[PDB]
Amino acid sequence: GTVNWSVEDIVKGINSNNLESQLQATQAARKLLSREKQPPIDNIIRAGLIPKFVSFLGKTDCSPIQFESAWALTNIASGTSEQTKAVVDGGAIPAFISLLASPHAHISEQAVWALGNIAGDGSAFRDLVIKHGAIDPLLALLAVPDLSTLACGYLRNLTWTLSNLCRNKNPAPPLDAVEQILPTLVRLLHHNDPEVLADSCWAISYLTDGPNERIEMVVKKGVVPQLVKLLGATELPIVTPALRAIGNIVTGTDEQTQKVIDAGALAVFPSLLTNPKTNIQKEATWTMSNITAGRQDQIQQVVNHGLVPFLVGVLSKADFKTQKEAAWAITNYTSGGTVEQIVYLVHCGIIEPLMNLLSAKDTKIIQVILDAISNIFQAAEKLGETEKLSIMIEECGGLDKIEALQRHENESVYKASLNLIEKYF
């Protein structure tokens, strides 16, 4: 019936003075735009069909053509920024927001979906969707006593669109919009659908990616314990954004960091720091590095949880990117730690894998490591066990690598390495 029409045929039908002919052509357009293999989005745009689709959104008397055009427009907006813009330029934003109040759930859902694509394009369209007043009717769709009564697909789409309203960073979403969305977000974070949980976590990770005032808005909502729980989920699509959120949070103040420690996050890290997915190991190690950048009592918690052997482990063997984060974690630790904490690090076997990494062709990690060596020697000086440390480094081949780094391209590398030898070797 409406399968595989030409764009010419679609135009002919949409241009007829006949609502049913228009409906059939619009459905034909939706099927064209729904195919996986290279939908002719630009041809549809160039035919001038977007204003027609947008006007069909307003035809309350013909709910089928509202749905078909919403779907068609959704899929145009799912494309490039230029394609999303064409949709916005056709006046689609206020028309979709009006459709959020549709009596027909499949139509309001499609409107939710379309707005998600538009907002997902970037900060500007996100903020434009917010200015046209989308947040109130979106949240109203979720104002039910029990989220479980909503259709599953419907709830997932709403959650996904809300997360796009939270997404992107220059600038971040308006503070008032974030304040408005957060309580619904907190509630979605306690829902039992894995996709809803994933997208809720993504939203939270977006909101916590910024200055500490942004982090505080989220932390004040009391979500950290729920995030830590989700950190232990079996589903990788949930663990990943939960961990990003937790990692974001510990980039904050010592007090914000202490919240994730208090919530029991550290007991999950034996698994996270040995996780089969390299991205999880990397994010977990980055998170650890920011925890070792905290107070001495926070470093002590890392110790108590037995995580220093796991850091030695990752420094010893991991994807290089993960190893670099471990290097940071160690340099941070040795920077803020007590002498006893630093001694403990050495007794856990940090020196050999630390030295092994000095042969990396990455000048940044070298500077990081040399700094760590320095810090450990400073602690060893306060103990007068500098001799013992120098030997340890020599016995595992460290002195060789440090000797070589004296003739290094980078200024501060050459400097730091010579300084070490001229003071300890």
């Binding site: 990616d209 980039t251 950048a293 920077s335």
Partner: peptide, 6 residues
């Protein structure tokens, strides 16, 4: 201060 944002 030693913290590193994303």
């Amino acid at each position: 201060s030693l913290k590193r944002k994303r």
